[PDB]
């Protein structure tokens, strides 16, 4: 085939997949060894009983649509498009597909140094929550933060979903429900790129990942 | 009987507290009504800032308040889904204003009626049991966000969005949780988001609120 969209490495790493016979963003594995080790791949090869398959279309009932996720096609990073499936993930363990958990996704903006809003809806959420992810601590920045300098030394930045700061590019409308407190200050447990993270939201709508 | 009138909170949310005639509001001398915003059932042109409650429309900008709790004299009555409880017409500086769209509280909090208004509401409650019925996980009670929910205390604040502690005696608690008595089918259109969570902006009793929905899990209002 011509190739498929595929996860940013963090997504597969957080699911416990590090090697690939075919995907350049992961550690190379000889294809001869893929039958005997878990691999992330775009080839739904039944000879590889432990595999995380990324595909353009579903391949099984348990295929997970990864919507608005950053992704890669060959060497190139693409930004998530809100409401559009970036890729499907199907996890096989000993030949059997497994139900994957729900999660929100990083958008790929960090990887390509994009500081722009994905759409007007995101812009409006930011405007309504001016103390969410702008380095306020009682720091954590969204890629769209008004206080992020143009030149960030990458070496010293901690990425949320895995320091100088912590950095996130989550589509803000996926977090909006969390960012207005029901009653009190709250520390949410949530899944981002299949990794458990903590989102701290103070009564004054100051918010950051821990 | 006579003219139905809003629950106090509806008028308060529009900036009206004084009334020359309505007992549920702060009494104002009629001679001062030309100088204060007044909620009233009298469409008196001498009171240029006034919120007129009427049984029938009085202007093109009269807003039908459908299914809202209401008062006639000192008695509070439940709203009936799909039936107009009263009309509201807001005048600022003598000119009728367009009122925005809103959902309405049903009067259940004020009379302490904790029953479903009909089978349709019961059914909506059952479609999101965490949100509207409530449940217990360990020492934590989740999702008691309606006047019909479990684990509620005996005194509920008379508010559009009430804040309350909830208890499963000897088992679980939650210190603060928001609660309304809105007719749950009014929210149906907001309860099936494509996304795993969504924040809707809307009005409840003319107060700007947000409805947070988590797909197939929970929903609650926030001020
Ligand atoms: Cl909840």
Swiss-Prot record, chain B:
Disulphide connectivity of cysteines: none
Active site residues per record: 130, 145, 174
Domain of life: Viruses
Domain AV-Nsp11N/CoV-Nsp15M: 2-97
UniProt subcellular location: Host cytoplasm; Host nucleus
Domain NendoU residues, every copy: 99-221
Reaction(s) the record says it catalyses: uridylyl-uridylyl-ribonucleotide-RNA = a 3'-end uridylyl-2',3'-cyclophospho-uridine-RNA + a 5'-end dephospho-ribonucleoside-RNA
Subunit (UniProt): Interacts with host OTULIN.
Function (record text): Plays a role in viral transcription/replication and prevents the simultaneous activation of host cell dsRNA sensors, such as MDA5/IFIH1, OAS, PKR and NLRP3 inflammasome. Acts by degrading the 5'-polyuridines generated during replication of the poly(A) region of viral genomic and subgenomic RNAs. Catalyzes a two-step reaction in which a 2'3'-cyclic phosphate (2'3'-cP) is first generated by 2'-O transesterification, which is then hydrolyzed to a 3'-phosphate (3'-P). If not degraded, poly(U) RNA would hybridize with poly(A) RNA tails and activate host dsRNA sensors.
Protein name according to UniProt: Uridylate-specific endoribonuclease nsp11
Organism: Porcine reproductive and respiratory syndrome virus (strain 16244B) (PRRSV)
Gene: rep
